[model samples]
Target: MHDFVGFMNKISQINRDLDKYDHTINQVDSLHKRLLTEVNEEQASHLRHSLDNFVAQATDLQFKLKNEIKSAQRDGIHDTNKQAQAENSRQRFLKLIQDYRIVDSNYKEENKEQAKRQYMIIQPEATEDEVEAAISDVGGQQIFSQALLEAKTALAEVQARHQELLKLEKSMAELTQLFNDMEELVIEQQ
Candidate 1:
């Protein structure tokens, strides 16, 4: 359900982005529901590299949380409670990893497309002289502006989603402790 909601919201934004920008935003329509960027080839590559770093760092954090933490019985008390706590943390972390992977996959694919499009647009060998006359009168400046708007829109959505990811992750950490405390209370009851 979360994935469905995220996909719907993102896809709607892509439509909205196309409307706001221009016909070029038709390309935006082709991108994944969640866009990491809408930029020219050069910039998209740069963004893709940065995203790689972010994903790597996030993966490292998840590894530490899962392997380094002992939520289960530290001492010889009821190991059940701590085990539950650790399991909860592990699930939350797994959920986050899924979310990141979806977004990262989308980002990388789009970056690849952007790079290809850039080549097709500017490469003399890729361009056909037949279509040149038809497109010669097109306003490059206006086109550039529209491209910029939609690209920024994509970037903004990525930032917002990243924030959402962080919020969920932090709350997961907090809840892990809460689980531990509640388990202690239950033990005292018995």
Candidate 2:
């Protein structure tokens, strides 16, 4: 049937998209490690900017692939061979997505470590507890503004990274939800 061919074409396109997405995630992992190694803020900022853009592109690809899978499922392939192939493709994509999640989690941990390091640069002699308190305190910004003019650049950098981490956390959760939704769709096909 024409519908079956259409479904096959869409599935092939999804495979191509997944390959591109996987490549981008690999680059993201490398860029994240590179960011941690760079000493200059300007260089680090450029890497972070590129990392953010890659993450966004990956997210866009995920959305596109999700919709493509949904549309392909609706096309309703009748051949058992086609169905098996589709299931295999879905499994491949799921594995890739899960793998990327692990990479992102590592990136998140590294971000936390870097934030702690920045805080230490601003407070060289502060005890561990004091450092933790300063990083976690919601009102600490007011305190820093009143008394920490000399470390303003470091303070700003840490805050910016903190914001980046928050957005990363949000996107990670969204990806998880997207994965779950896609899993449901694949199950529904069976």
Candidate 3:
């Protein structure tokens, strides 16, 4: 009976952790919107930092849940229905992350183009030396050139976030497999 109680407690805890995971994903979506739509560079930079932390939090939760699931298995607890629900949630998470990746890539391309156009507007007849000056911009006198530099920095951060999302997506896939294996074990036992 104690083992049974322990199993149920773990199950409930898993449910609660899953709720937390969903909340993190929602926060990610909200931050993504603010970063892409409503923020200046300073605000966007702050949002990107928030994004990094939230993604890291989500990854940590995933790791914790995996260990909990393993612990439950060790106690011979298996619920096929819950396993299916977990798989569904994992699928949804993966889909949302993929959508974010697509939007992020599009934004990066648009930003690059905007920076290039700004440069052209500033110096259409720029010679090679002028281009080099714009690139260096040691005096920070070139407004458009500074814009380009900021854009480059922003793009690099976005790329880093993109890579993090890719890794999280892979982890989600692995979690799904764990659920699948649990479901199969439940069936075999029945």
**lDDT of candidates 1 onward, in order:** 0.42, 0.78, 0.58
Positional deviation of residue 147's Cα in model 2 after best superposition, in angstroms: 2.9
- Return the lDDT, model 3, position 133: 53
Q: Any runs in candidate 2 off by more than 4 Å, and if so which?
A: 1-4, 76-78, 121-129, 137-139, 142-149, 186-190
Of the pair 2 and 3, which is ahead by lDDT?
Answer: 2
What local lDDT does model 3 show for residue 169?
Answer: 55
Best by TM-score: 2
Residue-level lDDT tens digits of model 2 in 1-190: 8756776787889899989989988988899789879999889888988998998999898888888766666554665776766677677778878888888899898887776676677678978877767777563575576675556676677678778788878878987998898788543445
Cα misplacement distance, residue 130 of candidate 2 (Å)? 3.8
Ranking by lDDT: 2, 3, 1
Report the C-alpha lDDT of model 1 over 62-84, residue by residue, as the tens digit: 44443333222231134454445
**Can you write out model 3's per-residue Cα lDDT over 1-190, one digit (the tens) per residue?**
7645765676778778777877887776677667658547777778878987986787687677666665555445356654555554445444544444454455445544444444555579976565555533252245434565555654464455445556545655654654454444322343
Per-prediction tally of clashes: 2, 0, 0
lDDT against true structure, model 2: 0.78
Each model's RMSD to truth, in Å?
A: 17.9, 3.1, 8.7
TM-score for each predicted model, relative to the true structure: 0.35, 0.82, 0.49
At residue 125, give the lDDT of candidate 3: 90
